[PDB]
Amino acid sequence: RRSVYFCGSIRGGREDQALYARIVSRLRRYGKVLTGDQFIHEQNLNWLQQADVVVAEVTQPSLGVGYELGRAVALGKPILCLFRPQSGRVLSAMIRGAADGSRFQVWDYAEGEVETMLDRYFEAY
Amino acid sequence: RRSVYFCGSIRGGREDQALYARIVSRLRRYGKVLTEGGDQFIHEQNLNWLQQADVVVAEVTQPSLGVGYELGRAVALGKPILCLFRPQSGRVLSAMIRGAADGSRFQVWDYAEGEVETMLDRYFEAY
């Protein structure tokens, strides 16, 4: 059974929290979902090393999500970023520009599509 | 000359623009500041500068994917890091940045809005 690490804004804001729950619920079909500040950081870094794939929802700007992505790229992890363009935001150049189409992927989606997007990525992975 | 890479929110919000310019100015005293095609060019140019950099300085008060990402890449390259956070903002700093501190290779310092130059001074003559 493969490991999935999911990334989503917390102190950047909990606006998309309910959408994170849907993503996590869907990911459970595709693997085990892995996901006092030092302990938080070390436990997360531990789980990040274990993960076979990293999935982030990057619509809500977040330091932690970005940092997780950064450590994940350096660890050679396959990454999927999901961004909602209809949110009115322009995605961070550093995230969007990291997309190489294989190891680092960034997918634009509509709020109601999230499940079908996840299925599409994993049915190809 | 010594190279400094500076990180600050752009697409996460420009609330702290002025404070970055203040930081950049002071950093110029301690070395060359590398940070003054599309997004792919921006990422590639920035990774190149990050690799060259001797030290990484980030203002982490405004939440930002890019800043976090840069800090993540920087840790993995083994760069010395300094994060500055402003508790006056009312925000609670991300656990992942605050928890990433080891007090030498990765420092996270709290500051008040008039202390920014004096905080930067402290780090560089202890560097």
Ligand SMILES: CN1N=C(N)c2cn([C@@H]3O[C@H](COP(=O)(O)O)[C@@H](O)[C@H]3O)c3ncnc1c23
């Ligand atoms: C209590 N707490 N606080 C966080 N800020 C915090 C951040 N994170 C991780 O970092 C990301 C959120 O970063 P922030 O939005 O900066 O909070 C999430 O993807 C989490 O995996 C956490 N994981 C467990 N507990 C956490 C946190």
Ligand SMILES: CN1N=C(N)c2cn([C@@H]3O[C@H](COP(=O)(O)O)[C@@H](O)[C@H]3O)c3ncnc1c23
């Ligand atoms: C045009 N543009 N847009 C960005 N979002 C953007 C982000 N960044 C880098 O990423 C950090 C800001 O990321 P975001 O706040 O997510 O935009 C800064 O510290 C910059 O070094 C950039 N560097 C040059 N040009 C940029 C950007």
